[PDB]
Amino acid sequence: MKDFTPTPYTLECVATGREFEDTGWMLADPQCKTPSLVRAKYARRQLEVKPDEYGFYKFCDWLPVRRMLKGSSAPVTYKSKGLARHLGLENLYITFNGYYPAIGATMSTCSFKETEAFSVCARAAEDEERVLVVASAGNTARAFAKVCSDNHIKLLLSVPYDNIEALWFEHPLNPCVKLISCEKGGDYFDAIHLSDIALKGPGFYAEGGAKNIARRDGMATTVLSAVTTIGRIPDYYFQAVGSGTGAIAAWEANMRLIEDGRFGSNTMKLMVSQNAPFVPMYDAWQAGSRKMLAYEDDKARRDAEIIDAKVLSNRRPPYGITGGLYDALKATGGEFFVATNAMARKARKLFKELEGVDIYSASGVALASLVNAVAAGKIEKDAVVMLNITGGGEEHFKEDKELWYLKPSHVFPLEPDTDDVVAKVEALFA
Ligand SMILES: Cc1ncc(COP(=O)(O)O)c(/C=N/[C@@H](COP(=O)(O)O)C(=O)O)c1O
C-alpha cells in the first residue's frame, strides 16, 4: 500500500443535499423519504492520478475505498485510428475495458464490471462477518466471484440460470463464493428479486446495485481515464445501458471534474443505448416519463431472451429514482438510442476488423448507436467523442485456456418460498 490512506469523503442525499458521514455501507439517507441515491463528496477535490502500479486504484482519490486489493487493472483510453476514419471522425477516443494486452488493457475478466468489484470489495470492512449479496446478469458476477475468491470474501451471487455461461474462470474458485439462480426463463430482475429474498436472512448484507457509491465511482474510472488521457472533457459519451448505472456514474464523474476545474467546465452529452426488443428505458425516455412504463412481465422476459446483449435487460432499473438515469439524461442534454441484433452484430465485426479485438454484444450496441448517430448527422466531425467499450477480448483471453465454471447450489422458482430460500442460503455458509 506504500503511501495510501483510506479515501476521505462524506455522503450527500441527492434529493435534499443533506450531508452526513458514512457510518458504514450506507446505501440511502434514512432521513429522506422520497427515493434518492446518495453520492460521495470527496475531500480530495482535485484528482491526483497515482502511478501505474496502483492499477485500478490509481483513481483512489475519488473511490470510497478503505484499502487496496492486489492485481487490479484500470481502463485504457486511446485515440482511434481505424474506426475514426471509417466514421469520418477527427477526435474519437475509445475507452477499452477488457483483455487487449497490445494496448495495455489487462482486465482478465473481460469487462468494466471489474471496476465495480475492486471498488466495492475495497469499501467493505475487512473484518466484515456478513456475506455480501450481489445480483447480476453475468459480468458483474464474474468480476465479483474472482475478486472475492482471491481475497477470501464471503459472497453470495444471484444470477439467472439462463446466464450462468458467463461464470467462467481460469481456475477453481474458493468455496467462500456461492451461487444461486432463478429458474430457466427468469431474467435479471428475477435474480434481483431472489437476492432480496435471500437478504431476509441474518448474516447477509446487500451490495445494493446502483445504490452503492463504490459501484458507481468504480465504473466512473472509465471517464476519469478518458479525461486524464485526452486532457479535456469529451463532448459525447457513448455507452450501452441495462440499469444505466454507468451513465449515472459518467455524469457524476463529469460533475466532479467540473468542480476540480482543471479540465474545463463543459458537460458531456450522454448517448445511451439499449438492444431491441428490450428497450424499456428508451421507451420511458422517449415518452418524457420519469416513471418506467407498463411492461407485462412475461413479455419482458421473452424480449430478454431475444436480445443478443443479455446484460442490457433490467426490468427495474434506477431510472426514476432521484439522481438516476432520467435525471442524468435531463442534466446532460442526453439522447437515447436503440440497436437491433443485426446492427450490434455488424458493429462487433466492424470493431474487430478496424481496432483489432473482439467486443461483447453490449459494446456492439453502443458502437451501433454511434454509427447511427453519425449517419443521422448528430455528431460534428471535430467533436470529442468517448466510446465506452464496456467489454471485450474474451475470445482472445479464452484461447488455449481450460475454463472452470461456477454453477448454482440451488435453482429457485421465479416466485420462491421465502423460508426455503433463507434456510438454504444460511446453510450455504453455515
Ligand atoms: C459489458 C457490459 N456493458 C454494459 C452494461 C450495462 O451497465 P449499466 O451502466 O450499469 O446499465 C453491462 C451490465 N452488466 C450487468 C447488468 O448489470 P447492471 O446492474 O445493469 O449494472 C451485469 O453484468 O450484471 C455490461 O456487462
Atom number, ligand 1, closest to the C-alpha of residue 136: 24
Atom number, ligand 1, closest to the C-alpha of residue 391: 1
In b/e form, how buried is each residue of 305-315, taking b as 16+ CB within 10 angstroms? eebbbbbbbbb
In order of 73, 126, 416, the CA distances from 3 in angstroms are 19, 19, 48
In order of 25, 156, 212, 285, the CA distances from 205 in angstroms are 9, 10, 12, 32
The response to whether residue 390 sits with its C-beta less than 6 Å from ligand 1 reads yes
The response to whether residue 313 sits with its C-beta less than 6 Å from ligand 1 reads no
Strand order in 410-412's β-sheet? 204-206, 131-135, 155-158, 177-182, 410-412
Pairing relationship of beta strands 204-206 and 131-135 according to DSSP bridges = parallel
Atom number, ligand 1, closest to the C-alpha of residue 137: 24
Q: Is the distance from CB of 355 to CB of 348 less than 8 angstroms? A: no
- Give Cβ neighbours of residue 190 (< 8 Å, ≥ 6 apart): 160, 182, 301, 414
Atom number, ligand 1, closest to the C-alpha of residue 97: 1
Q: Which three cell numbers stand for residue 287?
A: 415518452
Closest protein CA for atom 3 of ligand 1 = 390
Q: Which three cell numbers stand for residue 19?
A: 450531508
The response to whether residue 362 sits with its C-beta less than 6 Å from ligand 1 reads yes
Q: Is the distance from CB of 272 to CB of 240 less than 8 angstroms? A: yes
Cell 464471503, located at residue: 154
H or E segment to which residue 200 belongs: none
The rounded distance, in Å, linking the Cα atoms of 424 and 412 is 11
CA 294 to chain centre: 25
The rounded distance, in Å, linking the Cα atoms of 140 and 427 is 24
**What are the helix (H) ranges across 199-290?**
213-219, 221-230, 245-260, 280-287
Cα 97 to averaged position of ligand 1 atoms, centre (Å): 12
Which domains does the chain possess?
Answer: 76-111+214-398 (3.40.50.1100), 131-202+402-430 (3.40.50.1100)
Burial of 5 (0-12, 13-18, 19+ CB in 10 A): exposed
Q: Is the distance from CB of 251 to CB of 393 less than 8 angstroms? A: no
Q: Which three cell numbers stand for residue 53?
A: 502500479
In order of 35, 73, 278, the CA distances from 419 in angstroms are 28, 41, 33
- CB < 8 Å & 24+ apart, contacts of 313-316: 313/137, 313/187, 313/188, 313/242, 313/275, 313/278, 314/137, 314/188, 314/189, 314/192, 314/242, 314/243, 315/187, 315/188, 315/189, 315/280, 316/189, 316/192, 316/292
The response to whether residue 113 sits with its C-beta less than 6 Å from ligand 1 reads yes
Q: Fill in the DSSP letter of residue 14.
A: T
Atom number, ligand 1, closest to the C-alpha of residue 142: 23
* Beta carbons within 10 angstroms of residue 229's beta carbon: 15
Helix orientation angle between 325-332 and 280-287, rounded to the nearest 10 degrees: 50
Closest protein CA for atom 10 of ligand 1 = 245
The response to whether residue 140 sits with its C-beta less than 6 Å from ligand 1 reads yes
Three-class DSSP category at 311: coil
Cα 111 to averaged position of ligand 1 atoms, centre (Å): 9
Method: X-ray
- Give Cβ neighbours of residue 52 (< 8 Å, ≥ 6 apart): 58
Cα 87 to averaged position of ligand 1 atoms, centre (Å): 26
Q: Fill in the DSSP letter of residue 129.
A: -
The rounded distance, in Å, linking the Cα atoms of 76 and 104 is 7
Burial of 7 (0-12, 13-18, 19+ CB in 10 A): buried
* Beta carbons within 10 angstroms of residue 197's beta carbon: 20
The response to whether residue 167 sits with its C-beta less than 6 Å from ligand 1 reads no
Q: Which three cell numbers stand for residue 97?
A: 475495458
Task: Give me the amino acid identity at 354.
Answer: L
The response to whether residue 360 sits with its C-beta less than 6 Å from ligand 1 reads yes
